[PDB]
Amino acid sequence: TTFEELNTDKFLRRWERERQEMLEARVKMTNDNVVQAMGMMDQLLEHM
Amino acid sequence: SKNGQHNEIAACINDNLMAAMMHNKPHFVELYLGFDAKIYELKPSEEVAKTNITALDELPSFALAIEELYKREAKKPHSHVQRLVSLSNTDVLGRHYRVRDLANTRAYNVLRMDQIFARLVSKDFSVNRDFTIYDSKYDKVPGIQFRRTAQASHMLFLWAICLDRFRMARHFWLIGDQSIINALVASRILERLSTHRALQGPHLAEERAKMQHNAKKFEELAVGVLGECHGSDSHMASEMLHSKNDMFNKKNAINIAYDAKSLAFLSHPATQSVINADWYGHLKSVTSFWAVLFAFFFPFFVLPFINFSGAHRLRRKFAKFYSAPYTRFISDLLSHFVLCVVTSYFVLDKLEDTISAIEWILLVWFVALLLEELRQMIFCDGIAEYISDTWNRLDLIMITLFFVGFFTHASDPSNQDSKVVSKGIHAFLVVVLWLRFMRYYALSKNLGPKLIMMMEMMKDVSTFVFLLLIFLIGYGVAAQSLLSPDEDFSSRTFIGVLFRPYFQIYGELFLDDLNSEANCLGDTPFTECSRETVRMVPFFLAVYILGSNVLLVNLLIAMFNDTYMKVQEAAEDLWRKQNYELCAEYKDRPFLPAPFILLAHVHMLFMRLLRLCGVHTQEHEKIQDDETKRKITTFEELNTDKFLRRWERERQEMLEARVKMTNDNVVQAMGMMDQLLEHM
Amino acid sequence: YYALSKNLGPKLIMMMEMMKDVSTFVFLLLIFLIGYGVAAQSLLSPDEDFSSRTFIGVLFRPYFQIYGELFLDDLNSEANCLGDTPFTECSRETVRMVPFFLAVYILGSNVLLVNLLIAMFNDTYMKVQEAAEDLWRKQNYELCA
Amino acid sequence: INALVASRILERLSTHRALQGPHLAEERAKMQHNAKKFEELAVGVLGE
Ligand SMILES: CC(C)CCC[C@@H](C)[C@H]1CC[C@H]2[C@@H]3CC=C4C[C@@H](O)CC[C@]4(C)[C@H]3CC[C@]12C
Ligand SMILES: CC(C)CCC[C@@H](C)[C@H]1CC[C@H]2[C@@H]3CC=C4C[C@@H](O)CC[C@]4(C)[C@H]3CC[C@]12C
Ligand SMILES: CC(C)CCC[C@@H](C)[C@H]1CC[C@H]2[C@@H]3CC=C4C[C@@H](O)CC[C@]4(C)[C@H]3CC[C@]12C
Ligand SMILES: CC(C)CCC[C@@H](C)[C@H]1CC[C@H]2[C@@H]3CC=C4C[C@@H](O)CC[C@]4(C)[C@H]3CC[C@]12C
Ligand SMILES: CC(C)CCC[C@@H](C)[C@H]1CC[C@H]2[C@@H]3CC=C4C[C@@H](O)CC[C@]4(C)[C@H]3CC[C@]12C
Ligand SMILES: [Mg+2]
Ligand SMILES: [Mg+2]
């Protein structure tokens, strides 16, 4: 039971890591990050 | 807008919007719509001369502006609009078969285009125009502004669907109302427009394809809004699908969709739920095909059949069970099956010296079918709709064959020759009867799509028949001349050219028979013959079966394989369309089987003579209230808005859109970065 | 006992799947077979009482003509057509329509229905072909169990 | 074991007797899809 729970946790961590290396997820992550980058850029220009 | 210059926006918005429509810039048409662009306030560039027609003068200004667009588009070389107007063969007011100065200067008026599109959809689609709502006296009324937009949008919508501009069409579709019905109408106009008669040419091919593409997009729209309806309130969505619409002559939406040949709309769960609920009637959907048949054979063991919906309960239960279309289909199947078995027995068994009892039973049965066919002809939408069905063609041919054969036997029953000729005609009757029995295979998810595939492969055979005749006639004339030379032409020569050559393509070789006919006397088949020319028959044949059995038959197998992949992918859609056609056909079918449908026929005729005529007391009228109609329209607009918001959200999650958005955003990020470094 | 093999095993599962495809074919062919058989049997032997031989006659040739075996010499003998050309000098003019009915029938049977079944077989093979390994591993367990 | 049980319930649920109708077709497909996902889970942990 302990071995099975540990391997369940290992699979899901590995599954999440594998799913983050997909093209769709990386493009989605890149898009949201650039939007957040311009928010930080707006904050910078205000400070200037 | 922020600086209070809204009046200047409103003064120039109509011409600017007009210019945007002329120069094919959809993004600019949306931009303008919302900043007070009133589609009904358009003005023509030139002034139209009076034409002494009360219909043409009663038009609004926005009405001459849709014409000017058609004239500008039409004056360009090889424009399909001018060819369609010319091939329509109508006058200036849109009246059929009535085609001067009035016919050429105002050939592209909105009323004439409305009539052409109305004839393009179906035989019963009429869009009622009411231009009077554009008067200043109809201004204190609350909701008119919506009506004026919707009507105006509709006219522009029809123009934008015609020139195949999907984006402007979709926009004007969004401005107006009856979104689902308008999308189906748009799909129908693009599909009919894609073939018609003017666009038939090879060079217009890519162009017609575009139309079909556009067609697909619009039904996709029609499905989509509906889907939201199915995921917002299923029963109210069902009420919308059962709702009688004013443009078509009180046809519901599923019938409109079937007439528009929209397979995607018909395959939708909401549409299928309405068709399935109508199909099973007041019978639980989970009732066996076996259970209903057994209950048909055993009506007093049917009390425990399935949850449904003294005297007024047993009687009510019998009237609901025998009023269901599924039960009527099962009764018609069994009845037609007995007709096939009994008629097959009748043709196989010997005819008597007088009209036998089984012959009289079949005579009564086919009159009853003839009366049923006459009933179907009177109670339909049209003669063209009836004759379109392949099963109606098969039933008319089978009734016609039986009566020719019977009268042939009945003219002289004590005659051997009459019996032989009559049985010869009745052979064709039994073949067409068993072919007509395949109609009841359509309920099954395996057997149904296969009939459609069979009619498609019948089209492939005809192509094969055209290709084979070359080999068959050429080899047959050549081979028949080589086998039997110096013989006068007769009917036997014609039978000889066609018989063996055709049957040699199925692997049956007549080489022993051809050896006997060649008069070649030897253990080796073609050596010791009287004439040396007959030794070339095995060679001609050698080429021929290489051409026929190996090349043409296998080429047909390849055509069949393509045809199967084609009807295989849309087997589900075609089965769902057949599902509707079964449901529609059995709603009006009297329940009693075919021999016993004479009692039902005389009962309906007696009822018809009594009611809705002299000394009548029975009349039914079921008209929907205005409240439920306004509920369906508001619900439909809300679900249209929900679909488009969901559609935009889904389209922004696509890979192409996200990559495009990411690219433009990074470019803007460097612009902001340039501004930063300058500040530093 | 073929199920242990990686080639022979998945093929039995495919055979039971194509047995299901035949049953569909049987339902589609009966229409042509019974219709042509009743029509052809009536044209060949008219004015004869119904018996078990009539029933054997409707089913025998029509079924065996779908495999390319033509009974044209036998049908010529049964039609009582006395001539070098097979159907000209017959006693009755109705029997000259047998070669035509047959002409439609084998076009329907040997060219259209059999090849349609071949297409169904091709789909069935692609279907059990992709999961041939999975089905073999399930048979592996069933042998083991 | 729960993932296998989930796969079994979705596959049996996908046909059963109530969902037999033509209009529930897309719906049952979804079930099968879900079924596939859960056995994928059952395989995955096992793989670890
Ligand atoms: C639409 C299809 C199914 C119907 C075809 C019409 C059939 C039933 C008709 C058309 C021509 C007819 C033939 C015309 C003449 C003769 C010669 C006579 O001595 C025997 C019957 C025979 C051979 C007829 C049999 C029936 C016949 C073949
Ligand atoms: C290109 C291919 C499909 C050609 C079509 C073949 C058809 C037209 C040919 C092939 C075999 C032919 C039949 C062969 C023999 C006979 C017997 C004769 O007493 C009457 C005509 C009849 C019944 C012929 C009618 C026409 C026929 C059916
Ligand atoms: C270009 C294609 C058609 C190839 C041509 C080959 C033809 C012309 C050949 C192939 C087989 C040949 C036949 C074979 C044998 C004999 C027997 C001989 O005693 C007379 C000629 C005759 C009857 C030949 C005639 C020509 C023939 C038919
Ligand atoms: C590899 C394959 C395609 C070989 C080609 C087969 C050809 C060359 C063979 C097959 C059958 C043969 C024919 C069989 C019988 C005869 C009758 C004889 O009196 C003259 C030759 C003739 C007419 C032969 C000519 C050659 C022939 C047509
Ligand atoms: C629509 C389809 C079925 C085509 C119809 C073609 C049928 C009706 C034709 C094709 C071949 C024809 C037969 C060919 C030759 C003869 C011989 C003649 O002395 C009597 C009629 C008879 C026996 C014909 C009857 C009609 C016939 C069977
Ligand atoms: Mg709307
Ligand atoms: Mg009919």
mmCIF file of N, CA, C and O and ligand atoms in Angstrom, chain B residues 332 369 372-373 376 386 389 391-393 395-396 436 439 585 589, ligand 7:
data_model
loop_
_atom_site.group_PDB
_atom_site.id
_atom_site.type_symbol
_atom_site.label_atom_id
_atom_site.label_comp_id
_atom_site.label_asym_id
_atom_site.label_seq_id
_atom_site.Cartn_x
_atom_site.Cartn_y
_atom_site.Cartn_z
ATOM 1 N N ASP B 332 -46.321 -2.409 -40.924
ATOM 2 C CA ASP B 332 -46.037 -2.278 -42.356
ATOM 3 C C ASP B 332 -44.962 -3.268 -42.824
ATOM 4 O O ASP B 332 -45.073 -3.804 -43.938
ATOM 5 N N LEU B 369 -53.331 -0.756 -51.659
ATOM 6 C CA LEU B 369 -52.015 -0.066 -51.768
ATOM 7 C C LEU B 369 -52.152 1.114 -52.736
ATOM 8 O O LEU B 369 -51.549 2.164 -52.462
ATOM 9 N N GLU B 372 -53.737 3.818 -50.883
ATOM 10 C CA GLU B 372 -52.719 4.356 -49.976
ATOM 11 C C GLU B 372 -51.739 5.285 -50.709
ATOM 12 O O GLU B 372 -51.329 6.314 -50.151
ATOM 13 N N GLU B 373 -51.335 4.912 -51.941
ATOM 14 C CA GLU B 373 -50.489 5.764 -52.792
ATOM 15 C C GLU B 373 -51.189 7.053 -53.214
ATOM 16 O O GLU B 373 -50.536 8.102 -53.311
ATOM 17 N N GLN B 376 -51.225 9.238 -50.180
ATOM 18 C CA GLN B 376 -49.908 9.860 -50.058
ATOM 19 C C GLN B 376 -49.710 11.002 -51.052
ATOM 20 O O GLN B 376 -49.002 11.958 -50.716
ATOM 21 N N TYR B 386 -42.908 13.749 -53.613
ATOM 22 C CA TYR B 386 -43.340 12.352 -53.617
ATOM 23 C C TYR B 386 -42.499 11.532 -54.596
ATOM 24 O O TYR B 386 -41.972 10.473 -54.242
ATOM 25 N N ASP B 389 -38.531 10.355 -53.939
ATOM 26 C CA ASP B 389 -38.248 9.122 -53.208
ATOM 27 C C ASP B 389 -38.155 7.930 -54.160
ATOM 28 O O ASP B 389 -38.973 7.787 -55.074
ATOM 29 N N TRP B 391 -38.393 4.762 -53.228
ATOM 30 C CA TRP B 391 -39.391 3.791 -52.772
ATOM 31 C C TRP B 391 -40.781 4.045 -53.345
ATOM 32 O O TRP B 391 -41.539 3.087 -53.555
ATOM 33 N N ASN B 392 -41.138 5.321 -53.551
ATOM 34 C CA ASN B 392 -42.368 5.685 -54.252
ATOM 35 C C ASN B 392 -42.325 5.263 -55.720
ATOM 36 O O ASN B 392 -43.371 4.955 -56.304
ATOM 37 N N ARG B 393 -41.154 5.392 -56.364
ATOM 38 C CA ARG B 393 -40.984 4.894 -57.730
ATOM 39 C C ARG B 393 -41.138 3.371 -57.806
ATOM 40 O O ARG B 393 -41.869 2.880 -58.676
ATOM 41 N N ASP B 395 -42.833 1.432 -55.632
ATOM 42 C CA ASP B 395 -44.223 1.025 -55.288
ATOM 43 C C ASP B 395 -45.164 1.286 -56.459
ATOM 44 O O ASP B 395 -46.047 0.468 -56.686
ATOM 45 N N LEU B 396 -44.978 2.387 -57.168
ATOM 46 C CA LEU B 396 -45.787 2.637 -58.380
ATOM 47 C C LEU B 396 -45.503 1.611 -59.493
ATOM 48 O O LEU B 396 -46.456 1.186 -60.176
ATOM 49 N N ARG B 436 -38.274 -3.663 -52.982
ATOM 50 C CA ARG B 436 -39.052 -2.710 -52.179
ATOM 51 C C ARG B 436 -39.032 -3.052 -50.682
ATOM 52 O O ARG B 436 -39.133 -2.135 -49.859
ATOM 53 N N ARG B 439 -36.576 -1.188 -47.821
ATOM 54 C CA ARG B 439 -36.950 0.059 -47.136
ATOM 55 C C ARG B 439 -36.967 -0.071 -45.605
ATOM 56 O O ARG B 439 -36.646 0.889 -44.899
ATOM 57 N N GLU B 585 -42.597 9.635 -42.263
ATOM 58 C CA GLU B 585 -43.486 8.821 -43.136
ATOM 59 C C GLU B 585 -44.518 8.104 -42.288
ATOM 60 O O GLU B 585 -45.666 7.999 -42.715
ATOM 61 N N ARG B 589 -49.074 7.623 -41.555
ATOM 62 C CA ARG B 589 -49.498 6.252 -41.945
ATOM 63 C C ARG B 589 -50.677 5.775 -41.079
ATOM 64 O O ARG B 589 -50.551 5.880 -39.840
HETATM 65 MG MG MG E 7 -45.039 5.107 -50.656
#
